Amino acid sequence: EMQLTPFLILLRKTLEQLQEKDTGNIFSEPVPLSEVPDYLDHIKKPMDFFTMKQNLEAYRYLNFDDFEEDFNLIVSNCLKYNAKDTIFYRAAVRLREQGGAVLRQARRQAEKM
Ligand SMILES: CC(=O)c1c(C)[nH]c(-c2csc(N=C(N)N)n2)c1CCC(C)C
């Protein structure tokens, strides 16, 4: 229950804040399946911040939980695919932590709308 335009503005700002936490830009674009031929063997739904931006602009996120679910996929896919002793795995842990804080604040803003 709220106006659509301010909610989308909030999600755009939140998505920018989450991307800023991915300093290596390793989550900015889809995992290149040509370079990782086995990626889809066990990853059911790839996700990345560019796809999230597309989904946002296509009006596919109309509540906070659907936005947060796709962010959580970025994290969970990376934890699943990569071994614990890799930079990629630790980057996903760091994004989970830093992004979680961004998301809690953004949700508190939405609840005032
Ligand atoms: C495995 C994984 O989880 C990846 C995540 C989160 N991002 C990327 C990525 C984005 S862009 C790019 N570019 C090149 N040239 N590999 N790799 C990967 C695949 C990395 C390869 C080297 C195993």
Side-chain angles (χ1 to χ4, degrees):
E1 50 149 304
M2 38 162 103
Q3 190 191 340
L4 176 66
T5 300
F7 178 70
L8 298 176
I9 290 167
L10 174 60
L11 290 191
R12 288 186 191 102
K13 182 203 197 194
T14 305
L15 183 57
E16 289 179 329
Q17 292 170 326
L18 296 173
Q19 293 224 54
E20 282 172 19
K21 301 300 187 183
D22 171 22
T23 61
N25 285 348
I26 68 167
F27 303 117
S28 62
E29 295 175 338
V31 172
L33 297 171
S34 48
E35 298 252 283
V36 192
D38 66 350
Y39 190 69
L40 298 183
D41 287 2
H42 295 100
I43 301 304
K44 118 174 94 297
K45 183 177 174 180
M47 189 51 59
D48 67 277
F49 288 128
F50 182 76
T51 300
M52 287 192 67
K53 178 63 167 182
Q54 292 183 315
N55 290 341
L56 193 171
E57 294 309 335
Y59 294 91
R60 298 195 183 108
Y61 301 134
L62 300 175
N63 54 64
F64 204 82
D65 280 315
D66 282 348
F67 178 86
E68 177 164 2
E69 192 171 30
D70 273 354
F71 169 76
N72 287 342
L73 264 180
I74 296 176
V75 172
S76 292
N77 286 348
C78 188
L79 297 172
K80 177 164 193 191
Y81 184 76
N82 295 286
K84 291 185 85 193
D85 71 354
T86 65
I87 289 197
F88 287 159
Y89 187 103
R90 284 312 308 245
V93 172
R94 188 183 64 171
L95 184 66
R96 184 178 69 205
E97 295 176 348
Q98 295 196 290
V102 168
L103 287 169
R104 285 195 303 275
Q105 163 67 101
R107 194 192 282 273
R108 277 184 304 253
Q109 295 199 270
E111 290 173 356
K112 292 191 246 89
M113 292 174 160

